[PDB]
Write a protein that binds this ligand. Structure first.
Ligand code: KBA
Lengths: 299, 314
């Protein structure tokens, strides 16, 4: 069964690590951190890994119930409402955020015609109280009282609360899904170029801010639509590296080429940082299976 | 090119009319309103229609700029914002669409968050722009809701912290209210150019054309900022079907495709349905309410038939 990628321009793709459209392609060769994100992780033959799931509405979302108290403790279930089983071979409930920061969104409740309420809320994923693998998290509100206990609760993500020093935003620092003294488990593996002159290529989105100064961004290894496509196709991988070309359909010319690695990420032969300037109509097309000694044409 | 549907369970599908997961399949044979939604509209050979676009993040979203604070009789602080296309290019009112793609397609008080990132930077803050976000409501039935003209109005609880002339984003979250005075009706279209003007370039209405059949919907429940209610949004096809049909572009070999809802574990057909060329489903059922089916079920394409095919009763 032949391997394929969808035909979608950058303006038709969304981020797999936060609910945002893709804004630009991006490189940063001098990144010193280990890249080991857990959302947007899928092998080329269609195996989801980490905390990755298929719903665009599930990325950085939570479902559960508030237990007690401005901060509130919430037990979390699986996104489909079934109880989360901590013994399952996953790092945390699928969809759980995969980075350190103060995530800003809306908590809403519909009581078990029922009464309703919603408020702005913040979830600090670096907090010792952020233990989703144990089945519970904490969120804070500006609202001081009108949050009900024991009623079905939803968290809709919107952006970040802040990116100043005291807010610990770092997109490559994983949360401690079970707490500070416990090791994370069942992680999708780290990714990196394994050839001189190459660097990772990211799909970059800019993320909203509730206040303060800054222009924060979230980089993903593959867009959510690629995760969904690879899962459907389940095409066998015929080598460890696929050669793909970024083409201009109008002119028919290749703008640059890249390696698409079996574990699900891209590298290019580029020695600079920043956005990739390309026509709006461009997209990646599969060319052939190669190996780890293939020399990419410098972009 | 053979016609195909994706292999996705209800728990793997999302709504095409609001950013929500699909909760249940649903029927309502005695519906009196004309069904003519504009999001989630796609022919079986892949032609997007109405205000439909591909991004799940674009459904009921807006991008643009706030111009100034304005007066309005209703409770809150009100603001005018010009809107562009979702990709930032100017919206061209002469394009053959009802409104900018992504525009909401129903009457109601849509609740969400307005956020801004300034274009100018502050050297004292490391050459970085200032930001703000606040809860907001957009009343799609208001005479000031004129997206086809390039501008809309929204209200906030916050009284002052919204800047003029800065890039602005609306992220939808749910409804503000469903009380009588909030005019929620999922089948009543907005007046995209304002009161007393005729909407144009609409995706066509859908209806059964055979005795004993009714429309079948993918239903999601939508959050509420406050008040009583359990509101729902019904779409004709999920967003992942819109995305699949657009990619495949398979020619339609008749006006109706016969599809079966199968339980892959046992391999059995749970019920069958007609998938019409314009992009909607009908079933042979004479009751309203949810379809109770196993969690593993999904629709599978069987064959092209015609409008005189008799479906097996559900
Ligand atoms: C940078 C600011 O951050 C937030 O105010 C926080 C305090 N503050 C006011 C002025 N400087 N700091 C936003 O509410 C503002 O509109 C503004 O963007």
């Amino acid at each position: 069964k032949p391997f394929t990628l969808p035909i979608l321009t950058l303006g038709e793709l969304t981020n797999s690590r936060f609910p945002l459209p893709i804004d630009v392609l991006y490189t940063n060769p001098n990144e010193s951190a280990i890249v080991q994100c857990q959302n947007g992780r899928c092998t080329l033959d269609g195996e989801l890994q980490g905390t990755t799931q298929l719903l665009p509405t599930g990325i950085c979302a939570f479902r559960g119930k508030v237990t007690q108290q401005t901060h509130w403790n919430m037990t979390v279930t699986n996104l489909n409402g079934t109880p989360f089983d901590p013994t399952e071979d996953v790092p945390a409930p699928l969809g759980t955020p995969d980075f350190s920061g103060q995530i800003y969104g809306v908590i809403s409740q519909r009581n078990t015609l029922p009464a309703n309420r919603a408020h702005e809320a913040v979830i600090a994923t670096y907090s010792p109280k952020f233990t989703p693998k144990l089945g519970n998290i904490q969120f804070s509100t500006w609202e001081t009282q009108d949050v009900s206990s024991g009623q079905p609760t939803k968290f809709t993500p919107v952006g970040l609360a802040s990116v100043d020093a005291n807010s610990h935003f770092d997109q490559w620092t994983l949360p401690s899904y079970s707490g500070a003294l416990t090791l994370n488990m069942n992680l999708a593996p780290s990714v990196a170029p394994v050839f001189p002159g190459e660097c990772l290529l990211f799909f970059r989105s800019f993320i909203p801010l509730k206040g303060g100064y800054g222009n924060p961004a979230i980089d993903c290894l593959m867009p959510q639509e690629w995760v969904q496509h690879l899962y459907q196709e389940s095409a066998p991988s015929l080598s460890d590296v696929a050669l793909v070309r970024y083409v201009n359909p109008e002119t028919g010319r290749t703008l640059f080429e890249a390696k698409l690695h079996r574990n699900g990420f891209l590298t290019v032969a580029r020695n600079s940082a920043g956005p990739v300037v390309a026509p709006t109509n461009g997209y990646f097309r599969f060319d052939s299976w190669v190996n780890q000694f293939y020399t990419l044409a410098p972009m």
